Amino acid sequence: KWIYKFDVLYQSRNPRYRNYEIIRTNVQEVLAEIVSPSTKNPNSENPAVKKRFRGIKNVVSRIISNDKKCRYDLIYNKYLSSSDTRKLKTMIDYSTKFNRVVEVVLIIMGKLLPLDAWGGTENKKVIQDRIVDFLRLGANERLHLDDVLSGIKLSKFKWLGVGNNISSQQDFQIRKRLLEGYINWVFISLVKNIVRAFWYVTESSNMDRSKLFYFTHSIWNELSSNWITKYAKGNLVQVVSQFTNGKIKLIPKRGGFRVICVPLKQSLYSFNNKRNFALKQKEKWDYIFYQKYTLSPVRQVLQLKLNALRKSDMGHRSSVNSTNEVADRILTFRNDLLKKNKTLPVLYMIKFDMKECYDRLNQNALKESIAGIFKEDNENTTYHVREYGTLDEFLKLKRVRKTLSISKNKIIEVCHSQIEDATCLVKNKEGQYDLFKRKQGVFQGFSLSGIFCDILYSTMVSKEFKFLWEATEDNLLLRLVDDFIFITSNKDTLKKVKDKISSNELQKYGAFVNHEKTVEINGEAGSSNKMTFVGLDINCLTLDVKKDSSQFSRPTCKFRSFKALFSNLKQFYCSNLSEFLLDFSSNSLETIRENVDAILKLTFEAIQTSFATISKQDSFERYRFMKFLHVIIETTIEKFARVNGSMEGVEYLLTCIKITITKSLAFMATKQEIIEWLYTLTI
RNA sequence: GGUUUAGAUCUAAGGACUUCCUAAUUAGUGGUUUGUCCAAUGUUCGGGCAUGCUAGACUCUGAACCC
Ligand SMILES: [K+]
Ligand SMILES: [K+]
Ligand SMILES: [K+]
Ligand SMILES: [K+]
């Protein structure tokens, strides 16, 4: 939990490698960072460590001198500036190859540190093996400093000593303390600075978030500018000079970019003039208060009533919350028609989706939409919601195993302020960011923008697809918000719904149908039967479903007994339990339950396979599998709450895990004791 | 029969706290007393892992592997 990778991410800059040097500090400045990282003025330290100040001062000046004479210009051109105007297929093909970036990182590192600074040649390869490890680190993935030091022989650092071998115990304690400071300074101050100097590293919005992509600044600045000037024409406005400001962040896609705008806490000018650590502290703590007590309550009340709008109102019934609820509804529709027919008629189906649903959202229709769910109520009314708090605010007892209110007369005010005043900061060619508001839509990344689309399209479905609920036993649709699917039994109702999507009537709400991905399938015995909806392989005749079988790979179980099996699953359960998946703002609360079970299920059916293999050799103990479950369950609910910061539905998620594992233990009859233990989990 | 090795103790050498004296500032050097300290420190549900463990002794207790 010492070396984090997010420090390197998203650091864009236009470099000039003619006069360039990575170390920005001096020999006396790095010295304090090595001997006493907590506080400066190493003269306060003990007299025995000053005895070795000369050696620590000597080696740093040598790598600095090498840094000053390091011809970065020749390195860039030789290894990572062979680009050509090829117009490659997909954005991630422009990235520097991972073998190349580690090569450039190491050869710069190699010419920076002499083997004295590496601690011999046998330690140099060890440190290099951890430098490539840090490069393989995912976006959120961290690295423990003790792991980095495992294998590095301290005795070989004679410049870290007085010049002789380790004499006493006290000499060992301080030499190790000095080694930690140095090695940590190597990665934080040099390694992270090396990658930051040459590559804009991004998060590769497609799957396997542990993969980071290294884009050369020259390449990236050309790629983003081209894409952002096309986006600016339709979506952005140059505006004149907080809580409605964010920094734009376009992440790669299949030949495109997904424009995310991560909100910014600092004010309009406290971001520019960052040289005051008195104002930014007073403003970054305004944002945390703005969310918990003013921005979270408005979001909580919106959803809490849309759940009653989705059930009661027929129009919002077509709106879905999770990917699995679409499968159930068609399977209930499958069984609903078999009440009287019992021989399913020829079915007709269509699928379509909206282009840039967030970026095209009609702001004027949005304000009317939110007013629609408050139209029935009064205006000077106050809704109530419960407080959740952070996982740090659970200090009743460590090692985990009330109300709040806001007036709806103000919640409608803060909604409009997020639709109107939302403005991003794109970096100009000069290098200084500019302010841009939105012509249409709302930024992807703003908290309220999530539910803003969910409520609009639910209103949209209600106000437009009124024909399709007359004799709903024949046909019914599901939203799954950015997609759409419709199932019918007669051509009469299919011809009427196809007209509306192919007409401009739907783009009043700001929803433009993507006709390029609009598929039609009929069970006419020769047209088609197989079709794939979002995560559902829906058959036009039997309505069977198997979702991917693919999205999370096999654990490739080979391990022996007893607890070597468990260890591999633990480390490769949290790795598949990325905090991007558990994001409450990005995905739905119900959708998190689905994917957390898929990660859960694959690591329990692989247990049963290799359970009987080593069952003859070793009989498992019914109390070593308990603490395994306790750790797996605890680390899941702790990861889910700490990523969001709130604890919305932590009990909800709790009695989904202990449910999906009580059914994954049907084998091994008389497993009662461990199953009964799963029930008591409440704290 | 062969290989490897531990702790205790003794002696010598060095190291670490603490007062006094160093033409030291990309500097931190060298003598020193009136008490102490020289083996672990991290890490992992008392065993492993990583780093560290001066030099001798026919002083004492031993240990592990192969034939
Ligand atoms: K020493
Ligand atoms: K011996
Ligand atoms: K010995
Ligand atoms: K000994």
PDB file of C-alpha atoms (C1' of nucleotides) and ligand atoms in Angstrom, chain B residues 5-7 60-62, ligand 2:
ATOM      1  C1'   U B   5      25.702 -26.486  10.424  1.00  0.00           C
ATOM      2  C1'   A B   6      23.530 -23.964  15.405  1.00  0.00           C
ATOM      3  C1'   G B   7      23.413 -21.616  20.152  1.00  0.00           C
ATOM      4  C1'   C B  60      30.089 -26.191  26.830  1.00  0.00           C
ATOM      5  C1'   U B  61      25.738 -28.221  24.656  1.00  0.00           C
ATOM      6  C1'   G B  62      24.398 -29.820  20.034  1.00  0.00           C
TER       7        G B  62
HETATM    8  K     K C   2      30.353 -24.873  14.011  1.00  0.00           K
END
